[PDB]
Amino acid sequence: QNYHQDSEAAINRQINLELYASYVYLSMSYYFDRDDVALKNFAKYFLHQSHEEREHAEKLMKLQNQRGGRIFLQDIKKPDADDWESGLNAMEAALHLEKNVNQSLLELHKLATDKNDPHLADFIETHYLIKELGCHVTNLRKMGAPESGLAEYLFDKHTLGD
Template sequence: MKYLVVLAFVALASADVKNVRQKFNGATITALNEQITRELQASYFYQAYSQYFARSDVALPGFAKFFSEASKEERSHAEKLMEYINKRGGDVQLKEVKLQDVCDTVSKGLDSTTLSFTKTTSCICNFMTGDVTVLSGFDCDKSKRDDWHNGLLAMEDTLVLERYVNEELLKLHKGHDDDAHLSHVLEHDFLDEQVNAIKDIADKIRQLKRAGSGLGEYLFDQKL
């Protein structure tokens, strides 16, 4: 009897979902859930950088605050997508979020891009996991961290990640452009913001290259 009640409840719930869902297919729902994972990965990545800059042996509070806000913003993007899926009668499916996965994505972007970066590997994962490793193309050995231009390296990682997220959003938009409402939401709430973020981070990278390390980086940190 208990199982019959549960089955009846599930059947009623499914019927209610069908009342809401209109031209919102499984492929679209899957794609949106994958984008939620990307946004949460970006949030986790930025939180790692926030805690890195807050360390007493780094002591750049402006950067710590900047990346803390960036982490919250990416999480809010994920929450917006979750709310949207529910609004359209879909199913939110949360997947495992690993810091190393996003570091691998950023490293791949640093290594393959035609843009000019200081390194070809994202070092934050090596530092946050306690590893001391020299990786191809750039020295990530944390014992030599005094030679790092911390802010510049972080912003370069950020630019790659923001460009990656933007590219995935563009694919999502193109692949589901027959869904007028989804297209509107992506354009209004996500794509415009990504373009602005990419320009802002690119400007910060140029400024940090001019400022250099030491006093220049310290003064830059004060303005964040």
């Protein structure tokens, strides 16, 4: 039976995807920490996200062990950008990223379903950050970002500062 082989390879792919995502948020957080960007709450938002995604990876690592599989780590690739350009662009990038992480998470779930396997730690993690990142994107665009730096300043103070 190919299943426990597929099942642990999928979990292993997902572990690397979550560590990758944690790495992207870390990169974004400290971009807003730069003196020429200097948006403190944009930096806190992404840093907190960075820690949540590392927690997702550890949860899947605990899960791989509980199912008797073998954790197989890979390189954590660098993000696609060093310069994230703007708070709008970073939120757009976080939205794209979460969608892709979620898509590979549906496939993990469609593997344990579609092979009759309850015990799907997935049922807690799915789809909640996506709408929030989309709302952030929407509000920044309506305010005039990224051309308007006043928009991102005030979004940092009013939405992400609460």
